[PDB]
């Protein structure tokens, strides 16, 4: 399948070159997979989600996304126009308040929630979790991410936006999950992207158009935007049967575009997520 005039990040993930604008992908499109977006919520009524999104858990007075961040990330995973895996099922877990903030205890509870809740959902092609959040190093936060991964969920987490080594941030620093840095449309490391040996992969993160609350759209930047590209890619590849939740991060690194990004610090992987789809 070909989506013309796609957001640059979608085109990038199906291309061996920057500078194109059509997204190419197998029509299976993540059907039969599920992606949990652990964030500020998801505006599930947005036409872009086509009834495939739902809130399953909140720790606050509402499950609605009063911020936009979670809706944007969910849109990059799976919206019809802005999403990588256009037929996946999206499940929202609201661990962040409408200011985008959350206690680590709440975030940990949300991760353990997903590890159990997947057993209440129909995801025959596999389960992914996208975590566009983080703060300073916490062994307990890392352990929760490790448990979620161990339970059979492909966990993708943001590297962070400090232009610093991600070893000092959580869950970015957890070795067993997939830690995602950000790049721009010219294949440069995004100016804010964290780096370091703990990163597994880069995805598009600068000037990313996606869904927003109020039935709208907007372009924003962050490792929060790169992470759902990788989460959606994992769901798409799992639906194709090419990999599993336990092996998808490694498979994405195996099949990435290699050596094509600029301003990658010595010791950080130079790997850009790529779907290897041959039309």
From Swiss-Prot:
EC assignment: 3.4.21.64
The organism's place on the tree of life at top rank: Eukaryota
Coiled-coil segments: none
Substrates-to-products reaction catalysed: Hydrolysis of keratin, and of other proteins with subtilisin-like specificity. Hydrolyzes peptide amides
Ribosomal protein as UniProt keyword: no
Alphabetic keyword roster: Calcium, Disulfide bond, Hydrolase, Metal-binding, Protease, Serine protease, Signal, Zymogen
Record domain Peptidase S8: where: 7-279
Disulfide bonds: 34-123, 178-249
Binding of Ca(2+) 2, residues: 16, 260
The keyword Protease belongs to this UniProt entry's keyword annotation: yes
Function: Hydrolyzes keratin at aromatic and hydrophobic residues.
The name this protein goes by in its record: Proteinase K
UniProt source species: Parengyodontium album
Full-protein residues shown: 106 to 384 of 384
């Amino acid at each position: 399948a070909a989506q013309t005039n796609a957001p640059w990040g979608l085109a990038r993930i199906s291309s061996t070159s920057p500078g194109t604008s059509t997204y190419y992908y197998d029509e299976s499109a993540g059907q039969g997979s599920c992606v949990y977006v652990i964030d500020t919520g998801i505006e599930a009524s947005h036409p872009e989600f086509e009834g495939r999104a739902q809130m399953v858990k909140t720790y606050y007075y509402s499950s609605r996304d009063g911020n936009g961040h979670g809706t944007h990330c969910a849109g990059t995973v799976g919206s019809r126009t802005y999403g990588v895996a256009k037929k996946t099922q999206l499940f929202g877990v609201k661990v962040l308040d409408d200011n985008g903030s959350g206690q680590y205890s709440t975030i940990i509870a949300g991760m353990d929630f997903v590890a159990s809740d997947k057993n209440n959902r129909n995801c025959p092609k596999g389960v992914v979790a996208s975590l566009s959040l983080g703060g300073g190093y916490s062994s307990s936060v890392n352990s929760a991410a490790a448990r979620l991964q161990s339970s059979g969920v492909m966990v993708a987490v943001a590297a962070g936006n400090n232009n610093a080594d991600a070893r000092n941030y959580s869950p970015a620093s957890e070795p067993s999950v997939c830690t995602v840095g950000a790049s721009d449309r010219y294949d440069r490391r995004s100016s804010f992207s964290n780096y370091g040996s703990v990163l597994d992969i880069f995805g598009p993160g600068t000037d990313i158009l996606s869904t927003w609350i109020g039935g709208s759209t907007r372009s924003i930047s962050g490792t929060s935007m790169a992470t759902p590209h990788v989460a959606g890619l994992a769901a798409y590849l799992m639906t194709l049967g090419k990999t599993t939740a336990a092996s998808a991060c490694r498979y994405i690194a195996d099949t990435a575009n290699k050596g094509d990004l600029s301003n990658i610090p010595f010791g950080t992987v130079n790997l850009l997520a790529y779907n290897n789809y041959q039309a």
